[PDB]
Coordinates of C-alpha atoms and ligand atoms in Angstrom, one line a residue:
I13 CA -5.5 8.9 4.8
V14 CA -6.1 12.8 5.2
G15 CA -8.6 15.0 3.2
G16 CA -9.7 11.4 1.3
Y17 CA -13.0 9.9 0.8
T18 CA -15.1 6.9 1.5
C19 CA -13.9 4.6 -1.1
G20 CA -17.5 2.9 -1.0
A21 CA -18.3 -0.8 -0.2
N22 CA -15.6 -3.5 -2.2
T23 CA -14.8 -0.8 -5.1
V24 CA -11.2 -1.3 -4.2
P25 CA -11.4 -5.1 -4.7
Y26 CA -7.1 -5.5 -4.9
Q27 CA -7.0 -3.9 -0.8
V28 CA -6.3 -6.0 1.5
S29 CA -6.2 -5.4 5.2
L30 CA -3.2 -7.1 7.1
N31 CA -4.1 -8.3 10.4
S32 CA -2.2 -9.6 13.3
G33 CA -5.4 -9.5 16.3
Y34 CA -6.3 -6.1 14.5
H35 CA -5.8 -4.2 11.3
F36 CA -2.2 -3.0 11.1
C37 CA -1.1 -2.5 7.2
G38 CA -2.8 -2.5 3.7
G39 CA -1.7 -4.9 1.4
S40 CA -2.2 -5.5 -2.8
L41 CA -3.6 -8.7 -4.1
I42 CA -1.4 -8.5 -7.3
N43 CA -2.9 -12.7 -8.7
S44 CA -5.3 -15.6 -6.4
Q45 CA -2.2 -16.6 -3.8
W46 CA 0.4 -13.4 -3.6
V47 CA -0.4 -10.6 -1.6
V48 CA 2.5 -6.9 -2.1
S49 CA 2.6 -5.2 0.4
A50 CA 5.9 -2.7 2.4
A51 CA 8.6 -4.1 3.9
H52 CA 8.2 -2.0 7.0
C53 CA 4.6 -4.0 7.8
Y54 CA 7.0 -7.5 8.4
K55 CA 5.9 -9.4 11.2
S56 CA 4.9 -13.2 12.1
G57 CA 1.3 -14.3 12.5
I58 CA -0.3 -12.1 9.5
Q59 CA -3.5 -13.1 8.3
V60 CA -4.7 -11.6 5.1
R61 CA -8.5 -10.4 4.8
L62 CA -9.4 -9.5 1.5
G63 CA -13.5 -8.3 1.0
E64 CA -13.3 -5.7 3.5
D65 CA -15.3 -2.5 3.6
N66 CA -15.8 -2.0 7.4
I67 CA -12.7 -3.9 9.3
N68 CA -15.0 -4.3 12.5
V69 CA -17.7 -5.8 11.2
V70 CA -18.5 -9.3 8.9
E71 CA -20.4 -7.7 5.9
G72 CA -20.5 -10.7 3.4
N73 CA -17.8 -10.3 1.4
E74 CA -15.0 -11.8 3.6
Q75 CA -12.3 -13.7 2.6
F76 CA -9.8 -14.5 6.0
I77 CA -6.3 -16.5 4.6
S78 CA -3.7 -16.5 7.0
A79 CA 0.0 -16.1 4.8
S80 CA 1.8 -19.2 4.5
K81 CA 5.4 -17.3 3.6
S82 CA 6.3 -13.6 4.2
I83 CA 9.5 -12.5 1.5
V84 CA 11.1 -8.7 2.2
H85 CA 12.9 -7.9 -0.6
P86 CA 16.9 -8.6 -0.3
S87 CA 17.8 -5.7 -0.1
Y88 CA 15.3 -3.9 2.0
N89 CA 17.3 -1.2 4.6
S90 CA 14.9 -0.3 7.6
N91 CA 17.6 2.7 8.5
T92 CA 16.3 4.2 4.6
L93 CA 13.2 2.7 3.6
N94 CA 14.7 1.7 0.4
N95 CA 13.3 -1.2 -1.0
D96 CA 10.3 -1.1 0.9
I97 CA 8.6 -4.3 -0.3
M98 CA 7.4 -7.3 0.9
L99 CA 5.3 -10.3 -0.9
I100 CA 2.7 -12.7 1.2
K101 CA 2.0 -15.9 -0.1
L102 CA -1.5 -17.0 0.8
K103 CA -2.1 -21.2 2.6
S104 CA -4.8 -20.9 -0.4
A105 CA -5.8 -19.0 -3.1
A106 CA -9.0 -16.1 -2.9
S107 CA -12.2 -17.0 -4.3
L108 CA -11.2 -14.1 -7.4
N109 CA -14.6 -12.0 -7.4
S110 CA -16.1 -8.5 -8.7
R111 CA -15.3 -7.3 -4.8
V112 CA -12.2 -9.3 -4.3
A113 CA -10.1 -9.2 -7.4
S114 CA -6.2 -8.9 -8.0
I115 CA -4.0 -5.5 -9.5
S116 CA -2.2 -5.5 -12.5
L117 CA 1.7 -4.6 -12.0
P118 CA 2.9 -1.8 -14.0
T119 CA 4.6 -2.8 -18.0
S120 CA 6.3 0.7 -18.0
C121 CA 6.9 3.1 -14.9
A122 CA 4.0 6.1 -14.6
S123 CA 5.2 10.1 -14.6
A124 CA 4.9 13.1 -12.6
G125 CA 0.9 14.3 -13.2
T126 CA -0.5 10.8 -13.7
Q127 CA -3.4 11.1 -11.2
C128 CA -3.0 7.9 -9.0
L129 CA -5.5 6.2 -6.0
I130 CA -4.7 5.6 -2.5
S131 CA -6.2 4.4 0.1
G132 CA -6.4 2.5 3.0
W133 CA -7.6 2.3 6.7
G134 CA -4.9 4.4 8.4
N135 CA -5.4 7.9 10.6
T136 CA -7.8 10.3 8.8
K137 CA -6.6 13.4 11.0
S138 CA -3.2 15.7 10.2
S139 CA -3.1 16.8 13.9
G140 CA -4.7 14.0 16.6
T141 CA -6.2 10.3 16.0
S142 CA -8.8 9.1 13.8
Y143 CA -9.1 5.5 12.7
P144 CA -12.3 5.0 10.1
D145 CA -13.5 1.3 10.4
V146 CA -14.6 2.0 6.2
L147 CA -11.9 1.8 3.1
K148 CA -10.9 5.8 2.8
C149 CA -9.4 7.1 -0.6
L150 CA -7.3 9.6 -2.2
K151 CA -7.0 10.5 -6.0
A152 CA -3.4 12.4 -5.9
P153 CA -1.0 13.1 -8.5
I154 CA 2.4 11.8 -9.0
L155 CA 5.2 14.3 -8.3
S156 CA 8.2 14.8 -9.8
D157 CA 11.5 13.9 -9.0
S158 CA 13.2 17.6 -8.9
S159 CA 9.5 18.2 -6.2
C160 CA 10.4 15.3 -4.4
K161 CA 14.2 15.6 -3.4
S162 CA 13.4 19.6 -2.7
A163 CA 11.0 18.1 -0.2
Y164 CA 13.4 15.3 1.5
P165 CA 16.4 16.3 0.7
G166 CA 19.4 13.3 1.3
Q167 CA 16.4 10.7 1.4
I168 CA 14.5 9.8 -2.1
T169 CA 15.9 7.2 -4.1
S170 CA 14.7 5.6 -7.3
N171 CA 12.6 3.2 -6.0
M172 CA 10.4 5.8 -4.7
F173 CA 8.1 8.6 -5.6
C174 CA 6.1 11.4 -4.2
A175 CA 2.5 12.1 -4.5
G176 CA -0.1 14.5 -3.2
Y177 CA -0.3 18.1 -2.7
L178 CA 2.8 20.4 -1.3
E179 CA 0.3 22.4 -0.2
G180 CA -0.7 19.6 2.4
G181 CA -4.1 18.6 3.9
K182 CA -4.4 15.4 1.6
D183 CA -1.9 12.5 2.2
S184 CA -1.8 8.9 3.1
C185 CA -1.3 8.4 7.0
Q186 CA -0.4 5.7 10.1
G187 CA -2.1 2.6 9.0
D188 CA -2.0 3.3 5.2
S189 CA 1.4 1.4 4.9
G190 CA 1.7 -1.2 2.9
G191 CA -1.8 -0.1 0.7
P192 CA -1.9 0.7 -3.4
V193 CA -0.6 3.7 -5.2
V194 CA -3.3 2.5 -8.4
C195 CA -3.0 4.9 -11.6
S196 CA -4.9 3.5 -14.7
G197 CA -6.0 0.2 -13.5
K198 CA -1.8 -0.6 -12.7
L199 CA 0.3 -1.0 -8.8
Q200 CA 2.5 2.0 -9.3
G201 CA 3.2 2.6 -6.0
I202 CA 3.3 1.2 -2.0
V203 CA 2.8 3.7 1.1
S204 CA 5.8 3.4 2.8
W205 CA 6.9 6.7 4.2
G206 CA 6.3 10.7 5.2
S207 CA 6.8 13.1 7.1
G208 CA 3.6 13.3 10.0
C209 CA 0.4 13.8 7.7
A210 CA -0.9 15.8 5.4
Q211 CA 1.7 18.7 6.4
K212 CA 3.1 21.4 4.1
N213 CA 6.1 20.7 1.3
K214 CA 6.2 17.0 2.8
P215 CA 4.1 14.8 0.7
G216 CA 3.7 11.2 0.7
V217 CA 7.0 8.4 -0.7
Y218 CA 5.5 5.8 -2.3
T219 CA 7.4 2.5 -3.6
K220 CA 8.5 2.8 -6.9
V221 CA 6.6 -0.8 -8.1
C222 CA 7.8 -0.6 -11.4
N223 CA 11.4 -1.0 -10.6
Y224 CA 10.1 -4.2 -8.7
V225 CA 8.3 -6.0 -11.4
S226 CA 10.8 -8.3 -12.4
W227 CA 11.3 -9.4 -8.8
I228 CA 8.0 -9.7 -8.2
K229 CA 7.5 -12.4 -11.2
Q230 CA 10.8 -14.3 -10.8
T231 CA 10.0 -14.9 -6.5
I232 CA 6.2 -15.9 -7.7
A233 CA 7.4 -18.1 -10.1
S234 CA 9.2 -20.3 -7.8
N235 CA 7.5 -20.3 -4.2
Ligands
SD9_304 C1 2.1 6.2 6.2 N1 2.8 6.9 5.3 C2 2.5 8.1 5.3 N2 2.1 9.0 4.4 C3 2.2 10.1 4.7 N3 2.6 11.2 4.8 N4 2.7 8.9 6.8 C4 4.2 9.5 7.4 C5 3.9 9.6 8.9 S1 2.5 8.2 9.3 C6 3.0 7.5 11.0 C7 4.3 6.8 10.6 N5 5.6 7.8 11.3 C8 6.4 6.2 11.2 N6 5.8 5.3 11.1 C9 4.7 5.1 11.4 C10 3.5 4.1 11.5
CA305 CA1 -15.5 -6.7 7.5
CL306 CL1 12.3 16.4 -12.5

């Protein structure tokens, strides 16, 4: 997260770190046994880390649970990033509490202007590189479809929305991938892609989760 603030330990209790020897992607807990992330975060050997603030220090609220099953969206295209969504089933149910909690799926799609909370352990600099160890937060509005398409001509599908600031300075970045965009207690987005981070007229591009709710519920019900 560039131009954000320190969330505060366990204030984003649905935020997960995906770990393969190191944090490499975020995710969102949507029930005791399932995480939503980006398809582009897919790899084997995933350990899901919940109750995390400092990902380099055991602080006392962590649950470390291995993935049993990953499911990349059937229609994921790694070239266009269309349908950038993946489900991870945990080997055991997470123990749910104030610091480890599922986030609600949307019943309706969110609209441009809706303020959202974007979070992750990604890079904090526009130019150069510094990884925070504690979770960073950004309040960002959803941008209009027309702005998003003007910013990235030829690239924005019906499964994508822009959120952030066309003036730049405030964005998601490298390592925030797969992480949540929450708007009024609902998971409306997944950190998917962008052009650099926090550049003028190059806002963050998010997976539009409301399009995927029936696939998510169907998949959970049979897996
Ligand atoms: C992560 N999504 C973003 N939000 C915004 N801006 N940032 C876009 C670039 S981040 C770095 C990168 N680019 C390709 N692969 C990787 C890991
Ligand atoms: Ca920790
Ligand atoms: Cl529009």
